[PDB]
């Protein structure tokens, strides 16, 4: 009865950590193209001489988002 | 739908990983570049990243797989649905809204916790009116665009 309710509250709280990880990885991926972290003279110059560096950083965050999305789906 | 130079840019990034030029990215080359930037992934984390895009099964990323991954980013149907499902886990009313305070709370206390400056940049990217509520459905539309 009430144990069934506190069980699904415990099966649901197991999703809250992977759900936060997915949101965090999604936001960090999105912020790669707009964050003030990259709005410096250093990154503009770095992005001018070797734009591959920023693309590499984005590729890593995409791979991390994909891993985070799977682990969240594995808690369903 | 990718321009010829847009492909050349992704090829340049792929070549940074693929240092020896054999057309594949292993855990060695993926982790070497990550750690050159100051990151410290574990070997298991590198295997999980590669397995997300390795459609052959040999434990590598080739350029076609890399190109598709870079083109899709988060713009797919499955990403929009699962990110929305993640926000729902922190939606008490089931109304598609979450208070900016509760969003700040979960981001800085669960999982790979966001820094204070990170979550501040996230809250500024969403819009707040009235009771401090953010419409996270329009927030995931912004991220997956
Ligand atoms: Mg190689």
From Swiss-Prot, chain A:
Impact after mutating residue 59 to D: Loss of CALM binding. Loss of location at plasma membrane. Loss of KCNQ4 channel current
Binding site for a 1,2-diacyl-sn-glycero-3-phospho-(1D-myo-inositol-4,5-bisphosphate) 2: 7, 10
Compartments where located: Basal cell membrane
Tissue: Expressed in the outer, but not the inner, sensory hair cells of the cochlea. Slightly expressed in heart, brain and skeletal muscle.
Stretch list, region Interaction with CALM: 19-28, 58-72
Record annotation: effect of changing residue 10 to A: Shifted activation curve of KCNQ4 toward positive potentials compared to wild-type. No difference in current density. Shifted activation curve of KCNQ4 toward positive potentials compared to wild-type. Decreased current density
Impact reported for residue 63 to D: Loss of CALM binding. Loss of location at plasma membrane. Loss of KCNQ4 channel current
Disease with which this protein is associated in UniProt: Deafness, autosomal dominant, 2A: A form of non-syndromic sensorineural hearing loss. Sensorineural deafness results from damage to the neural receptors of the inner ear, the nerve pathways to the brain, or the area of the brain that receives sound information.
Protein family per UniProt: Belongs to the potassium channel family. KQT (TC 1.A.1.15) subfamily. Kv7.4/KCNQ4 sub-subfamily.
Complex formation: Homotetramer. Interacts (via C-terminus) with calmodulin; forms a heterooctameric structure (with 4:4 KCNQ1:CALM stoichiometry); the interaction is calcium-independent, constitutive, participates in the proper assembly of a functional channel. The interaction with calcium-free CALM controls channel trafficking whereas interaction with calcium-bound CALM regulates channel gating. May form a functional heteromultimeric channel with KCNQ3. Interacts with HSP90AB1; promotes cell surface expression of KCNQ4.
Job description of the protein: Pore-forming subunit of the voltage-gated potassium (Kv) channel involved in the regulation of sensory cells excitability in the cochlea. KCNQ4/Kv7.4 channel is composed of 4 pore-forming subunits assembled as tetramers. Promotes the outflow of potassium ions in the repolarization phase of action potential which plays a role in regulating membrane potential of excitable cells. The channel conducts a slowly activating and deactivating current. Current often shows some inward rectification at positive potentials.
Record note on domains: Each channel subunit contains six transmembrane segments (S1-S6) with S1-S4 forming one voltage sensing domain (VSD) and S5-S6 contributing to form one quarter of an interlocking pore-forming domain (PD).
More details: Mutagenesis experiments were carried out by expressing in Xenopus oocytes KCNQ4 mutants either individually (homomultimers) or in combination with wild-type KCNQ4 (mut/wt homomultimers) in a ratio of 1:1, to mimic the situation in a heterozygous DFNA2 patient.
Protein name per its UniProtKB record: Potassium voltage-gated channel subfamily KQT member 4
Whole-protein residues included: 325 to 553 of 695
UniProtKB/Swiss-Prot annotation, chain B:
Keyword terms: Acetylation, Calcium, Cell projection, Cilium, Cytoplasm, Cytoskeleton, Disease variant, Flagellum, Host-virus interaction, Isopeptide bond, Long QT syndrome, Metal-binding, Methylation, Phosphoprotein, Repeat, Ubl conjugation
InterPro entries, A to Z: CALM/Myosin/TropC-like (IPR050230), EF-hand-dom_pair (IPR011992), EF_Hand_1_Ca_BS (IPR018247), EF_hand_dom (IPR002048)
Keyword Flavoprotein: no
Domain EF-hand: 5-40, 41-76, 78-113, 114-145
Modified residues annotated as N6-methyllysine in this record: 113
GO molecular function annotations of the record: adenylate cyclase activator activity; calcium channel inhibitor activity; calcium channel regulator activity; calcium ion binding; calcium-dependent protein binding; protein kinase binding; protein phosphatase activator activity; protein serine/threonine kinase activator activity
Residues bearing the modification N6-acetyllysine: 19, 92
Binding locations of Ca(2+) 2: 54, 56, 58, 60, 65
Residues bearing PTM Phosphoserine: 79, 99
Pfam families on file: EF-hand_7
Activity regulation statement: (Microbial infection) Inactivated by S.flexneri OspC1 and OspC3 proteins, which specifically bind the apo-form of calmodulin, thereby preventing calcium-binding and activity.
Annotated segments matching region Necessary and sufficient for interaction with PCP4: 74-145
Cross-link Glycyl lysine isopeptide (Lys-Gly) (interchain with G-Cter in ubiquitin): residue positions: 19
PTM description: Ubiquitination results in a strongly decreased activity. Phosphorylation results in a decreased activity.
Residues bearing the modification Phosphothreonine: 42, 108
SMART domains membership: EFh (SM00054)
Binding site for Ca(2+) 1: 18, 20, 22, 24, 29
Subunit structure: Homotetramer. Interacts with MYO1C, MYO5A and RRAD. Interacts with MYO10. Interacts with CEP97, CCP110, TTN/titin and SRY. Interacts with USP6; the interaction is calcium dependent. Interacts with CDK5RAP2. Interacts with SCN5A. Interacts with RYR1. Interacts with FCHO1. Interacts with MIP in a 1:2 stoichiometry; the interaction with the cytoplasmic domains from two MIP subunits promotes MIP water channel closure. Interacts with ORAI1; this may play a role in the regulation of ORAI1-mediated calcium transport. Interacts with IQCF1. Interacts with SYT7. (Microbial infection) Interacts with Rubella virus protease/methyltransferase p150.
Associated disorder: Ventricular tachycardia, catecholaminergic polymorphic, 4: An arrhythmogenic disorder characterized by stress-induced, bidirectional ventricular tachycardia that may degenerate into cardiac arrest and cause sudden death. Patients present with recurrent syncope, seizures, or sudden death after physical activity or emotional stress. CPVT4 inheritance is autosomal dominant.
Task performed by this protein: Calmodulin acts as part of a calcium signal transduction pathway by mediating the control of a large number of enzymes, ion channels, aquaporins and other proteins through calcium-binding. Calcium-binding is required for the activation of calmodulin. Among the enzymes to be stimulated by the calmodulin-calcium complex are a number of protein kinases, such as myosin light-chain kinases and calmodulin-dependent protein kinase type II (CaMK2), and phosphatases.
